Design a protein around this ligand. Structure first.
Ligand code: NA
Ligand code: NA
Lengths: 759, 759
C-alpha cells in the first residue's frame, strides 16, 4: 500500500500511475500535464516585488561586468551543502528563496576540486586566501586537481602546453550532470532516502558473492554518500525555515522544492555546466492545479516563476582568468529544456513554457538560465511564433531538434545538459571532456609532429611532408595517422580525469537524484572543424604551397586559386567536414574507457575557438596565425556568403549519428533579412528553423541552433558605450552572455563573425 | 660506467654485485656480511650516556604502567611525516635521534584512519579534541573508519556485536607492512626517488593502451604518493640536522638512515604492528667496516645499537580502551628478525645479532623491539646457547622456524611481520584480518545460528540440534555449514576493509620502500582452536548433555566421562585441531578477494582470546562462559599436562601448509624443569627447540615459539608488588609486554595459563 496519509494530501487531484509506487517523474508528467496550444495573450507582467528585487541585483551585475571580477567571494569557508547560513536579496519580498552563500552574487570556495585554482583566483582578484583552508586542501584532503597531475603523462603535459589538448576538466568541476531536481518536489526527501536505502541494500548479494567486487564496493559507498547528501538537503532547506521531508503540496512548494534540490548541487559542486533540466512542464502540473482551485492568480504564478528564474540568474562560481578565456562571459549553463513533443504525439508545451520565456520580458534579457526550445515541426504554431518573437526581441534563446533526439532516445523526458548534450533525466550523465584541437593536428601531420609555434616535438616523431606544393591524398593520410595519436592521448587524459573526479569530487547531491545505475558517456569534443575542412578543401581544389623556414617547418601557406569553403552548401567541402566528424568518431570508439563510458563526440568549442586559435599558427585554408577558430561547428568568420538557407544546410549535413554529444551552430541574422515587419520575421524565422530541423528517414537534419537577430553596428555601439546596454544578451557558442561581460579580445571575435545579410 | 661519486665514496671497500646497479638489499648483504660463529665474550656493556637516557625514559614508562594511560598526546595536531619538530630525550647524549612527536612518549593523532577513535581516546584519557581537527576529519577528509562503516552489511555488524567477528581493522591501522628501511641507508633517498620515477614511467604504456585501466591508474597514483613521501623523509631528517639524500657513509649513518625510514612510517601510520624487519645483520656490514678501519670501538658500536633499540622501545600510538583489550600491554610489534641461515648454507648470524640481544642486558628486559630468532638446527651452537641464555634471563624473545620458512620462500631475506607473519622484505605485504571466533561458530551450529548469549539470529536461520545427547557426525555437519558462512562474512568484511584502507590511508612512506609490484595475502585469523578441538573430542569420546532453556537453546553442557584434550600428544584430539585448520583454509581459499590478495590463515589471537572468551558462553569441552580462550594455538589453560615435549609435539602437528600467516604458541616453563644450573638449562632449552623446529620431508615441524622461563609465584608477587618489577617482561601471544602494563583481568589470564613443570 504505497500511499501515506500525507502523500495522499499532497497528491490530491492527481491522476494515478506507476509514479505513485516508484520514482518515475516521467510517468507523473505523462499522467498529469495539460497540453497547451493557445497563444501568449494570457501572460501577466512583473509585480513590484519582482522589479524591486531584480533592479537591486542588476546593480551587482553592472559591477561584475565593469570590473570583470566577482562582487565578492569567500576566502576562509569551505563550501558544502550546509556550510552557509540563509542569504537573501530582501526576505520580505522573495517568493522562492535560496542563495549559494549568505549574500547575493558572493562566490564560494569549492576546494575539493583543487586548491591551486582558488589561490589563482584570490591573487587575480586581490583577496587573501585563509592559510588554514590552504593547508587542509594540500596536506589533509587530496583534491581532484592534484590527483590528476600526479598521474598525467609528460605527453599529455606537452599537448596541454602546445595547445593541441588544452582546457580539459583537470582544474574545474567536470559538470555535465543533471540531478532530477523534480524528484524533491514530487516525492519529498524522506521518500527518496528510503528509495536510496533500498538501492544500497540491493547490492549486498553481489558484494557477499564477490561479483564485480570493486565496482560493487564503489557503488555502495557512492549510494551511501548520496543518502547522506539527501539528509543534508533537508538541513540546508531548514536554514530557510522549510521542511522538505515530505512532498510539495502546492505550486509554490513545487518550485521551491525543485530549486532546493538544485541549490544543494550549486553549493557543493562547481561544474562548468550546472544545468537545471526539463522542469517547466513538470511545474505546470502544480501551477494548473492551484489556478483551477483558485488558490493562485496568473500574475502570482508568473511571480513565482520570475523568482525561480531570478535565482538561476544569480548562480555564480569563482573562476580563474585562465578559465575565463576558455569559458567566456561568466557562464553557468543553467539549461532549461522547454516544450518538445511526447512519444504519444501530444505536445509537451504548456502554459509554463510561455511563462519561462516571458521572464525575458518581465525581467528583461538575460544569459542565464540558458533556455532551450525543444523544436519539432509538429509544435503548435502559436508557440513556434512566440519563441521566434522572443529570439527577435532578445537573442536569448537556443533551439535543438526534438524530432531528432526524441526518436533517437525513444524517450520524451530527456534534457539538454550544458550547451547541446542530451541525457535522459535521472538515468544518464556524461563524463565531460572539453575539446581537442583538430586544426593543430593537421599542422602536426604536415610538420612531422613538431609544433609550429613552439618548434618542439609534441606529436609522434615523423617525417614532415615534402614538396613545394601540398597534395590532398598525402596530407589526409598523414592527418589520419595523427588523429589516431590525438584520440589515444585524449581518451587517456579523460580516463585519468574521471577516475580522479569520481574519487575526489563525486557529485553526491546530484547523483542522489538519479537511479541506482546511470548511463555514462565519454564526451570528446572537436575544435576547429571548419578550419580543418577548408584547409583540406584548399589543398584538394586549389594549389597550396608551404613556406618553410631554415629547419623545414611549414610556417605559412601560399594559396593559388579559390576553393569551396564550409557553409556555402557546396558538397565538395561539406563532404570533407562530414568525413572528419566520422573519422575521429570511429577512432575514439575503439579505445578502452574508465567505467566503460561509451565514447561520444561533439563539434563544440565554447571559447576554445579563441584560445586554440591564439595558439595555432598559419593554416592551409588561409587563416592567419593567432586568429580565432569558428565557434563550434560554424564556418570560419565571414566565409559563409550564400545566405541563411545555404549555411544552415551545410551545418545540418554534419552527422549527429557520429556526434551524439551535440553539434553547435551560432547563427546571427540581421532584422531586415527576416522581413519588413515583426509578423513576417516571426513567420520566416520559424520557417527557417522548420527547414533546418526537418527530420526524415533520408534526411537527418540539424541538431542545434543559436539565434541572434541583430545588426553589427549595434554591437559596435555597445563596445563604445557599455552603460547603454546593461542587459544586452547574445548567443555565442551554445549559451548566452551579456555583451558587456566579455573581454575586448572576446568581443573582437564576436563582431568579426558572420552576420547573415539574406536568406 | 662511471658510478656516481657519492655512491663510490660511501661504498668504499664493499664487494661489487648487482646491488650497485639496482635496488637489491639482499645481494648487498650476501656479498658483504661477515658470518660469525664465535660466542658473546666480545660484548661490551652500556655507556653512561645510554644508562642516563634509558633511566630517564623509564620514569615515563613507570607512569604509563601506573596510570594505564599515555604520558601525553596531541590534541590539535594532525600527524604526518613532517608535522612535528625535532624532539629529544637529551640532544647532547643521543647517538641516534628521532621521535614521533616533539617529546619522549608523547603520542600523536593519526586522523586519516578515523576521527571517532581519537574522540574515544580523548574522552577516556581526560583531554579535549581540538574542534578544527574534528571538523576536518568528519566533513572534508573522509577516513578509513567512515568508509568501511558506510559499506558494511547489517550481517557483519551483527557478527561484530555478538563476538563472532570482532576487532577487525576497521578502527585502527591495518599494519602488517614492512618497508625496507635498509634501502635508505644503502642507497640514500635521491637514488630511491629516481628509481620510483622509473617505476612510475614504466606504467605509461599500459595506461595509454587501456590495459587493466583502473589498476594502472591506481598504481600510478600510489607510486606518485610514494615518490612524494620519499621527499618528505628528507625534510623530516633535515629537521634533525641530517641530509639523507645520499647513502650512509659509516655505521652511525647506516643505523640513523635506516631508523629515519622507520620513523617516517610511525609518524604517518598507526598500524597494529609496525615491524622493523631483518636489519641486524645488514647493519653489521657497516659496523664491521668501521671496526676494521679503527674508526669505531666495540663499546661505541654497542652504544649506537643501544640508542637505536632504545628508540624502538619508545614507539607509541594513541589507542582506545576497546583496542587495549584486543591488543593488550601497549604493544607495537617492532619486530626484528635475527640470525637465520642463508640459502648457500652459511649462517646469517653476525656479531650484531649478539649486540641486539645484548640490549636486554645493557638496558634491561623490554617488550619492544620484538626480537625474533630465526631458528635452524644448523645455527652455531654458540648462538643457540646465548639465545637460550637470554630467554632464561629475560623471557623477552620468540623463536620461529627458519628451517621451514626459508625453503618455503626459497629466500633468505624474509622478515617476520607482527607476531608470526613472514614476508620477503620489500617484495611482500599482508592485508591484516585480525581473527574470527571459531568456538562461537561451533555453538551456532548446535543452536541454529541463534546467539547463545544475546538470543538473536546472527548466523543463517536453521533448525537447532534436537538430540538429547550430542553426536559427532551431526554437530560436525552443521559445524562445516557454519564455517562456510563464517568464511563468507569474514572475507567480505576484509574485502571492504582493505578497499577502504587503500583508499583513505594508503601507507605511502612504507610502500615507497618496496618494489613496484608487491605480493599481497588476505590474512584470516582463527581464535579458540583448542576450545573447538577439545569440544569436538568431548562429543566423540564422552557423553555431552545439552542444558537447554525455555526456547530450546543450549546454554550449558554436562560431561560424563573423560575425553582427550589438545596438548598431550594424543592424536585423537590433535587430529581434530589439524582437521579444523585444514577445513577453514580450504573454505576461504575459494572466495574472491580485493586486489586478488591470496587468502592465508593464522592460528593467532593476541588478546582476542580474552575478548572472544568473555563473549562466548559455555562450550562442549567444559570451558565455562566468559572464560578466556587459549592464546593463539595454545592448548586451553592447564590442559596440557604431559610435559614440554608432549605439548610442543601437539602444536608442531598443526599444518603451517594450511596456515601460512603463522601459528602462535606461548610456552612457559619453570627454571628447574630445564635443569639444576644455567649451563644445563641453556643446553636443554636449545635441545627442546631443536626438536620442536626439527624439519624433515616427512615432518613439517613447529613454526613459532614464545619462551617464558619463570615461576607462577614470581608473577603473583609482581601482581601484589608492581614497583618491585619495573622492567619484568613476558611473552603473551606472539609478542612481549611488561607485566605491569596489563590490566588485572589480563594478568588473571596470564597466571592461570599452563606453567610446564617438566619436559
Ligand atoms: Na545533421
Ligand atoms: Na607446523
Amino acid at each position: 500500500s504505497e500511499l501515506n496519509e500525507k502523500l495522499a494530501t499532497a497528491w490530491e487531484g492527481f491522476t494515478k500511475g506507476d509514479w505513485q509506487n516508484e520514482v518515475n517523474v516521467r510517468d507523473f508528467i505523462q499522467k498529469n500535464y495539460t497540453p497547451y496550444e493557445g497563444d501568449e495573450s494570457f501572460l501577466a507582467g512583473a509585480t513590484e516585488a519582482t522589479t524591486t528585487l531584480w533592479d537591486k541585483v542588476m546593480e551587482g551585475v553592472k559591477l561584475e561586468n565593469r570590473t570583470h571580477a566577482p562582487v565578492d567571494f569567500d576566502t576562509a569557508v569551505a563550501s558544502t551543502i550546509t556550510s552557509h547560513d540563509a542569504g537573501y536579496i530582501n526576505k520580505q519580498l522573495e517568493k522562492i528563496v535560496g542563495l549559494q552563500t549568505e549574500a547575493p552574487l558572493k562566490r564560494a570556495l569549492i576546494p575539493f576540486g583543487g586548491i591551486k585554482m582558488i589561490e589563482g583566483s584570490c591573487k587575480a582578484y586581490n583577496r587573501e586566501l585563509d592559510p588554514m583552508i590552504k593547508k587542509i586542501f594540500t596536506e589533509y584532503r587530496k583534491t581532484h586537481n592534484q590527483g590528476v597531475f600526479d598521474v598525467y603523462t609528460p605527453d599529455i603535459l606537452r599537448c596541454r602546453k602546445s595547445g593541441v589538448l588544452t582546457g580539459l576538466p583537470d582544474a574545474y568541476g567536470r559538470g555535465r550532470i543533471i540531478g532530477d531536481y523534480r524528484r524533491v518536489a514530487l516525492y519529498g526527501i524522506d521518500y527518496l532516502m528510503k528509495d536510496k536505502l533500498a538501492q544500497f541494500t540491493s547490492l549486498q548479494a553481489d558484494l557477499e558473492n564477490g561479483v564485480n567486487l570493486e565496482q560493487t564496493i564503489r557503488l555502495r559507498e557512492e549510494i551511501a554518500e548520496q543518502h547522506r547528501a539527501l539528509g543534508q538537503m533537508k538541513e540546508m532547506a531548514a536554514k530557510y525555515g522549510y521542511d522538505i521531508s515530505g512532498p510539495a503540496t502546492n505550486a509554490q512548494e513545487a518550485i521551491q522544492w525543485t530549486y532546493f534540490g538544485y541549490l544543494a548541487a550549486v553549493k557543493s559542486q562547481n561544474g562548468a555546466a550546472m544545468s537545471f533540466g526539463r522542469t517547466s512542464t513538470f511545474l505546470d502540473v502544480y501551477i494548473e492545479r492551484d489556478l483551477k482551485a483558485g488558490k493562485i492568480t496568473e500574475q502570482e504564478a508568473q511571480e513565482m516563476v520570475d523568482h525561480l528564474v531570478m535565482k538561476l540568474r544569480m548562480v555564480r562560481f569563482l573562476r580563474t582568468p585562465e578559465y575565463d578565456e576558455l569559458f567566456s562571459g561568466d557562464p553557468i549553463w543553467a539549461t532549461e529544456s522547454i516544450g518538445g513533443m511526447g512519444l504519444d504525439g501530444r505536445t509537451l508545451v504548456t502554459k509554463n513554457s510561455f511563462r519561462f520565456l516571458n521572464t525575458l520580458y518581465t525581467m528583461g534579457p538575460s544569459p542565464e538560465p540558458n533556455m532551450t526550445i525543444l523544436w519539432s515541426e509538429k509544435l503548435p504554431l502559436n508557440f513556434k511564433k512566440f519563441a521566434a518573437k522572443v529570439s527577435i526581441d532578445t537573442s536569448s534563446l537556443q533551439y535543438e531538434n526534438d524530432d531528432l533526439m526524441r526518436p533517437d532516445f525513444n524517450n520524451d523526458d530527456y534534457a539538454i545538459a550544458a550547451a547541446v548534450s542530451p541525457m535522459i533525466v535521472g538515468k544518464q550523465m556524461q563524463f565531460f571532456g572539453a575539446r581537442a584541437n583538430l586544426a593543430k593536428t593537421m599542422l602536426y601531420a604536415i610538420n612531422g609532429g613538431v609544433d609550429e609555434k613552439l618548434k618542439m616535438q609534441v606529436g609522434p616523431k615523423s617525417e614532415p611532408i615534402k614538396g613545394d606544393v601540398l597534395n590532398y591524398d598525402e596530407v589526409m593520410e598523414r592527418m589520419d595517422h595523427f588523429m589516431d595519436w590525438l584520440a589515444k592521448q585524449y581518451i587517456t587524459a579523460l580516463n585519468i580525469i574521471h577516475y580522479m573526479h569520481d574519487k575526489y569530487s563525486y557529485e553526491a547531491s546530484l547523483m542522489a537524484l538519479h537511479d541506482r545505475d546511470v548511463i555514462r558517456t565519454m564526451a570528446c569534443g572537436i575544435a576547429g572543424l571548419s578550419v580543418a575542412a577548408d584547409s583540406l578543401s584548399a589543398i584538394k581544389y586549389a594549389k597550396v604551397k608551404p613556406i618553410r623556414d631554415e629547419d623545414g617547418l611549414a610556417i605559412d601557406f601560399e594559396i593559388e586559386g579559390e576553393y569551396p569553403q564550409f557553409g556555402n552548401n557546396d558538397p565538395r567541402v561539406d563532404d570533407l567536414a562530414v568525413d572528419l566528424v566520422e573519422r575521429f568518431m570511429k577512432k575514439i570508439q575503439k579505445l578502452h574507457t574508465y567505467r566503460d563510458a561509451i565514447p561520444t563526440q561533439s563539434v563544440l568549442t565554447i571559447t576554445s575557438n579563441v584560445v586554440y586559435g591564439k595558439k595555432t599558427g598559419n593554416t592551409p585554408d588561409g587563416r592567419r596565425a593567432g586568429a580565432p577558430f569558428g565557434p563550434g561547428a560554424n564556418p570560419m568568420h565571414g566565409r559563409d556568403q550564400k545566405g541563411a538557407v545555404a549555411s544552415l544546410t551545410s551545418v545540418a549535413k554534419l552527422p549527429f549519428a557520429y556526434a551524439k554529444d551535440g553539434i553547435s551552430y551560432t547563427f546571427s541574422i540581421v532584422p531586415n533579412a527576416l522581413g519588413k515587419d515583426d509578423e513576417v520575421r516571426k513567420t520566416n524565422l520559424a520557417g527557417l528553423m522548420d527547414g533546418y530541423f526537418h527530420h526524415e528517414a533520408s534526411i537527418e537534419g540539424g541538431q542545434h541552433l543559436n539565434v541572434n537577430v541583430m545588426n553589427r553596428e549595434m554591437l559596435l555601439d555597445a563596445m563604445e558605450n557599455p552603460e547603454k546596454y546593461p542587459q544586452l544578451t547574445i548567443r555565442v557558442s551554445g549559451y548566452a552572455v551579456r555583451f558587456n561581460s566579455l573581454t575586448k579580445e572576446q568581443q573582437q571575435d564576436v563582431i568579426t563573425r558572420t552576420f547573415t545579410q539574406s536568406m
